[PDB]
Amino acid sequence: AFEISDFKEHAKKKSMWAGALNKVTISGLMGVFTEDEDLMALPIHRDHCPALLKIFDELIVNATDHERACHSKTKKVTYIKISFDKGVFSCENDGPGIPIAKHEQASLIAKRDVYVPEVASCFFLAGTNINKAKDCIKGGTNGVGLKLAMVHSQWAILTTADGAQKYVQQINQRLDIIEPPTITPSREMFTRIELMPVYQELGYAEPLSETEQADLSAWIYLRACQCAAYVGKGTTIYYNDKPCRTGSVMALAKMYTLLSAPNSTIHTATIKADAKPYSLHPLQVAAVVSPKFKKFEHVSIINGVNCVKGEHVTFLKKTINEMVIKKFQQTDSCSNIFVVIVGSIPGIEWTGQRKDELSIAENVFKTHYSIPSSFLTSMTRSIVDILLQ
Numbered sequence: 001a002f003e004i005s006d007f008k009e010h011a012k013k014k015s016m017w018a019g020a021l022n023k024v025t026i027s028g029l030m031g032v033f034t035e036d037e038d039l040m041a042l043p044i045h046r047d048h049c050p051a052l053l054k055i056f057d058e059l060i061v062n063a064t065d066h067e068r069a070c071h072s073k074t075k076k077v078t079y080i081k082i083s084f085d086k087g088v089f090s091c092e093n094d095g096p097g098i099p100i101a102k103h104e105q106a107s108l109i110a111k112r113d114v115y116v117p118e119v120a121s122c123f124f125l126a127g128t129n130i131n132k133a134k135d136c137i138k139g140g141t142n143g144v145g146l147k148l149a150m151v152h153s154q155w156a157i158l159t160t161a162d163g164a165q166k167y168v169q170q171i172n173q174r175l176d177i178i179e180p181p182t183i184t185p186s187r188e189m190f191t192r193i194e195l196m197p198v199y200q201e202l203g204y205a206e207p208l209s210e211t212e213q214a215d216l217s218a219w220i221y222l223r224a225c226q227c228a229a230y231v232g233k234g235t236t237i238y239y240n241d242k243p244c245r246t247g248s249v250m251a252l253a254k255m256y257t258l259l260s261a262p263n264s265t266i267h268t269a270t271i272k273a274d275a276k277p278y279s280l281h282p283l284q285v286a287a288v289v290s291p292k293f294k295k296f297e298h299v300s301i302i303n304g305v306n307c308v309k310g311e312h313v314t315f316l317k318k319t320i321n322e323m324v325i326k327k328f329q330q331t332d333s334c335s336n337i338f339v340v341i342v343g344s345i346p347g348i349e350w351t352g353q354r355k356d357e358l359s360i361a362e363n364v365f366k367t368h369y370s371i372p373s374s375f376l377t378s379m380t381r382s383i384v385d386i387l388l389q
């Protein structure tokens with residue numbers, strides 16, 4: 001009755017890695033939809049499989065991680081291309097490829113030649129962030145995410161090129177069948193993961209129903225738009241070959257409030273910090289205040305991850321609340337706010353592989369960060385006007 005599992009089998013049956021492995025209710029699930037020429041983020045009020053969405057997220061965050069890694073270097077990431085068609089999902093970025101070289105330690109473990117890209121995609125607890133410094137702002141940390149994508153794929157293809165060679169490897173049947181790679185001369189330089197998720201095993205129709213396809217496409221498109229606001233000014237995000245031109249927190253705030261509060265005022269702030277490493281990482285904020293909003297909502301893209309819980313939100317709310325109480329007293333406080341926060345925060349710790357919640361001392365923000373007075377004052381004026389009416 002006491003059994004010992006390997007990683008691969010454990011990931012196929014345990015929700016702790018990527019979330020639930022069939023369809024459940026996902027609070028706050030959103031996608032983006034096109035109405036004429038406008039992008040509108042709308043709720044998806046249907047149950048979906050968290051682990052399936054995490055396949056896509058793990059690849060997307062790997063690409064944004066590489067963009068951040070290369071941003072200060074000669075060879076930068078200039079594009080991230082995300083595609084979803086006929087159930088096939090792919091994510092490709094340029095910048096330096098995954099090194100095409102024998103990995104000595106993995107080759108000894110496996111007792112055959114193993115190259116670095118196979119370590120990256122097929123070995124659990126393996127990657128370039130195992131000994132991550134506290135000031136690294138990549139989302140990736142565990143050396144797990146890409147293997148979760150592979151373990152939930154009926155077939156997958158890793159393709160990477162380093163400017164001298166190209167490496168193509170099939171990783172099939174939920175990590176059961178790793179085919180030897182094909183290595184050829186090449187002048188290209190990129191990393192591409194293409195895969196077909198195990199949709200039916202995760203609760204979906206075979207093939208996806210019209211509604212499943214539409215919901216998943218909308219979810220991926222919104223995730224791509226979130227990426228576009230996070231990456232550097234030299235990087236374009238594409239979804240199904242078309243650019244996601246939501247490159248500012250203001251554009252994100254408009255997309256989330258277009259139906260509920262069109263033609264609204266967008267309060268903006270860049271929250272800056274007083275010393276390295278924090279001072280390297282300004283946080284971009286855009287907020288809308290409306291009496292039509294029924295509860296506080298945030299969208300936080302932190303270290304490229306869509307974070308649903310963190311003390312950075314609490315810092316903003318408490319600071320606004322203090323000023324609202326004062327201004328209101330001269331003649332709850334956050335229930336009319338929708339706010340977008342995008343940027344990097346050094347030193348955060350995620351509570352699980354899913355990276356739903358970040359962990360930090362609240363005093364980090366009190367000590368180091370300053371919210372601009374103009375933003376606080378304008379937000380307070382709008383909130384108090386509502387409270388008086």
Ligand SMILES: Nc1ncnc2c1ncn2[C@@H]1O[C@H](COP(=O)(O)OP(=O)(O)NP(=O)(O)O)[C@@H](O)[C@H]1O
Pocket residue numbers: 058062063065066093097098120121126127128129130139140141142143144145146147191192
């Ligand atoms: N798109 C990519 N471009 C370049 N390098 C990549 C890419 N995807 C993955 N890698 C490399 O492959 C390694 C393994 O990826 P992954 O399994 O996702 O672990 P991780 O991103 O380091 N940590 P985590 O995602 O938190 O489990 C990464 O550490 C990178 O070095």
Ligand SMILES: [Mg+2]
Pocket residue numbers: 058061062140141144145146
């Ligand atoms: Mg990763």
